[PDB]
Amino acid sequence: NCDGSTFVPVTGSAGNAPSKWDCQLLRDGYIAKQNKSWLISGPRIIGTVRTCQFSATVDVSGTAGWIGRDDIMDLMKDSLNLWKMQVGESGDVNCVAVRIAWTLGHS
Amino acid sequence: NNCDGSTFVPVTGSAGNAPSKWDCQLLRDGYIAKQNKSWLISGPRIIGTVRTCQFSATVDVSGTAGWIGRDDIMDLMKDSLNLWAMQVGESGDVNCVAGGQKVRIAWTLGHS
């Protein structure tokens, strides 16, 4: 449902990066087991493992769009591959009703 | 001044992790506005902080380095605060003089 997502490294204070182990468990332990899609109409947390969190909003106010777990699977895999301070990754992606702004970062 | 247009991504996070907008106002007008300079970005670098609010940048493509100017940051901050689970920040990707000919700089306006 979501394709061609931009990738922007998010910068912040030393100490405010999530643990990458927490981000690994979020993808494989949590998101990977969610056989669903999420309706995004505003700021919404999709999942949390301790220090790591995936969240999303809509760019255009008043709009709503569907993001699936598998899209989040790919966005998380790509974000953790792009990453070596950096405290997160954000991106803009087009999804079935729509521009969805996602964030991988601290809880 | 040394960076073209740029792009805007609203950064989502936990309720309570947004900077104070007053701190972000002071950062732009009180702090950044008085810095008569450009910053060389080759890595994660904090450009300025007022209490809870912070402007920072890095390079996409490690090994590259690029110049971001006061007037770039003035504009990126004005545009981000106009555009602004709660939104906790704005990020963007912008093309800046390398200091190739052009270098991709990833900026963040957010919590300190």
- Residue A92 included in any domain: yes
State the count of interchain CB pairs (< 8 A) between A and B. Answer: 83
- Residue A2 included in any domain: no
Exposed (0-12), middle (13-18) or buried (19+): which is B14, by Cβ within 10 Å? middle
- Cβ–Cβ under 8 Å, residues A65 and A58: yes
- Residue A93 included in any domain: yes
Nearest CA-CA partner of A101 in B75, B7, B46, B56: B7
Distance CA(A6)–CA(A82), nearest Å, equals 12
Taking contacts as CB-CB distances below 8 angstroms, the residues of chain A near B46 are 11, 13
Q: Which residue of A has its CA nearest to B110?
A: A12
- Residue A61 included in any domain: yes
Q: Which residue of A has its CA nearest to B42?
A: A85
- Cβ–Cβ under 8 Å, residues A105 and A10: yes
CB contact under 8 Å between A101 and B12, yes or no, is yes
Residue A67 tokens, joined: 């993001």
- Residue B2 included in any domain: no
Taking contacts as CB-CB distances below 8 angstroms, the residues of chain B near A53 are 13-14
Resolution (A): 1.9
Distances (CA, A) of B42 to A21, A101, B65, B71, B104: 27, 26, 4, 19, 10
Q: How many residues does chain B have?
A: 112
- Residue B80 included in any domain: yes
For every residue of B53-93, DSSP letters joined together read: EEEEEEESSTT--EEEEHHHHHHHHHHHHHH--EEEEEEEE
- Cβ–Cβ under 8 Å, residues B10 and B41: no
- Residue A3 included in any domain: no
Total Cβ atoms within 10 A of residue A20: 12
List the end-to-end C-alpha distance of chain A, in Å, as a whole number. 26
- Residue B95 included in any domain: yes
Return phi, psi of residue B72, to 5°: -60, -50
For chain B, the farthest-separated pair of C-alpha atoms sits apart, in whole angstroms, at: 41
Range of the domain at B89: 9-111
Distance CA(A73)–CA(A57), nearest Å, equals 17
Q: Number of folded domains in chain B?
A: 1
Residues 68-97 of A with CB under 8 A from B: 84-86, 88, 90-92
